Amino acid sequence: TEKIRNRQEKIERYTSDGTTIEAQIDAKVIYVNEKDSEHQNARELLRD
Amino acid sequence: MNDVIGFFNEREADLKSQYEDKKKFVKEMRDTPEFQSWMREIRSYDQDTK
Amino acid sequence: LNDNPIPKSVPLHPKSGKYFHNLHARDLSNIYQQCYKQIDETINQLVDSTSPSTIGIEEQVADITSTYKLLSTYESESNSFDEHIKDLKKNFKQSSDACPQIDLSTWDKYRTGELTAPKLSELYLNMPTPEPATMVNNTDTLKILKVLPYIWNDPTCVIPDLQNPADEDDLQIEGGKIELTCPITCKPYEAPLISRKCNHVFDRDGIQNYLQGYTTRDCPQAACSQVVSMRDFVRDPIMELRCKIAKMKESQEQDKRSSQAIDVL
Amino acid sequence: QLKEDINSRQSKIQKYKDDTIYYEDKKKVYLENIKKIEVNVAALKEGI
């Protein structure tokens, strides 16, 4: 029973951490996509 | 098969416990001369009576 | 049979199930989408660097569209392959979920021969190919091709049945009668827009000057009584492709006229 | 790298779920065991 309760508390804390870090990776994907437009911006500046 | 080897280890531990029980049996076989010195002699010392 | 001391079949263990869940396929999606994007952008820079003086464009568009359809088929079959691999691993996990325990009796039964736990080996060596159907033709990159042929004769014309997807080459491109200027602005547009419901091309500045002011405004053209909103309009790159190709042809013919004036003088 | 880390922790969550399933199985096994043992000691007392 103590194995079950610590396993389920680890599961719920890992689910909460996974939701938080999935929001984080979504934000980071949007960030790297907006910086890709900054990547192409600097690329066009270098080309010019 | 590593888990099966661990199961073999616990089984051979049970077999060592069985050997310990057998050592208790040979100790009971050792406790026999305590009276077998008289149990083996009742076949010999009383020639006609036996 | 006794060729292998280990049993030919073996159940699954939670310690092994941990690593089994740790299995993952390679990130083919991102590399495939980025190579697709580099392929379409290099196709765009090809169709931008073309010139009317270059003769022999039919063979080059044929080979580039053959390469395009080949890479599309390869990507689709790889997608089907990884989907089938996921289905196979799900089958493996659901077959191992009903596996027996681990002890000496089960080991002996599986060593003497007991076809109870099917391994992934036999299911993977003769795995059924997915054979994907419904070829992906709705991609805009597939719409990019075939617009280069049949344009050196009359770029400012569009046959009404051009949107017919009955042909295998992404469209039925032929000569027709269409306007190259926007009637709202009365000027040859450089930023065109057209929706699937109205099927009418218009300038972006003209359509935004005509749309603002009313929350529900129909199209200026006839034969479409339904209202068209901002979300109904879609960005069709074929129209701007044709306009910029016509502009390039005009610049080329002007350069040719200037060179001829140089020669005659 | 952190996306692969997310995949690995999701696999670990699945492993923990399977471990909790096995723990519930052994728990219900022990429950049936103690139930048969308690009805045994019952039938003993009834008579003892």
C165 and C186 co-located in one domain: no
Nearest-CA neighbor of C199 among C234, C247, C168?
A: C234
C172 and C200 co-located in one domain: no
Mutate to test the interface with B, among C107, C109, C111 (most CBs of B within 10 A): C107
Nearest-CA neighbor of C206 among C224, C194, C223, C198?
A: C194
| CA nearest to B1 within chain C | C6
Secondary structure of residue A1 in the 3-state scheme: coil
C187 and C169 co-located in one domain: no
Q: What are C182's strand-pairing partners?
A: C187
| CA nearest to D1 within chain A | A25
Ramachandran class of C228: left when φ > 0, alpha when ψ lies in -120 to 50, beta otherwise? beta
Check A3 against D23: CB less than 8 A apart. Answer: yes
Residue corresponding to tokens 């009834």: D46
C31 and C152 co-located in one domain: yes
Q: What is the DSSP letter of C146?
A: T
C201-205: long-range pairs with CB below 8 Å, 24+: C201/C239
Distance in angstroms (rounded) separating the CA atoms of residues C158 and C179: 8
Handedness of CA B2, B5, B7, B10 (dihedral sign): negative
Does residue C263 belong to any structural domain of this protein? no
Check D20 against A11: CB less than 8 A apart. Answer: yes
C18 and C100 co-located in one domain: yes
Interchain touch B–C (≥3 Cβ pairs closer than 8 Å): yes
C217 and C96 co-located in one domain: no
Concatenated DSSP letters of chain D? -HHHHHHHHHHHHHHHHHHHHHHHHHHHHHHHHHHHHHHHHHHHHTT-
Identify the domain containing residue C48 by its residue range.
Answer: 3-181+236-256
Q: What are the b/e assignments for C7-19, b being 16+ CB within 10 Å?
A: bbbbbbbeeebbe
CATH number at residue C160: 1.20.120.1010
C39 and C118 co-located in one domain: yes
Check B7 against C13: CB less than 8 A apart. Answer: no
Does residue C264 belong to any structural domain of this protein? no
Secondary element (H or E) of residue C233:
strand C233-234
Which chain C residues touch B1 with a CB distance below 8 Å? 6, 10
CATH number at residue C225: 3.30.40.10
Distance in angstroms (rounded) separating the CA atoms of residues C251 and C48: 13
Tally of helices (H runs) and strands (E runs) in chain A: 1, 0
Side-chain half-sphere CA neighbours of C50 within 13 A: 25
Distance in angstroms (rounded) separating the CA atoms of residues C35 and C24: 22
C173 and C251 co-located in one domain: yes
Distance in angstroms (rounded) separating the CA atoms of residues C204 and C191: 6
Give the count of beta carbons closer than 10 Å to the beta carbon of residue D35: 10
Distance in angstroms (rounded) separating the CA atoms of residues C21 and D12: 7
- Of residues C17, C18, C24, nearest to D7 (C-beta): C24
Secondary structure of residue C155 in the 3-state scheme: coil
Resolution of the model in angstroms: 6.9
Secondary structure of residue C229 in the 3-state scheme: coil
User: In the numeric block, which tokens belong to residue C189?
Assistant: 């547009």
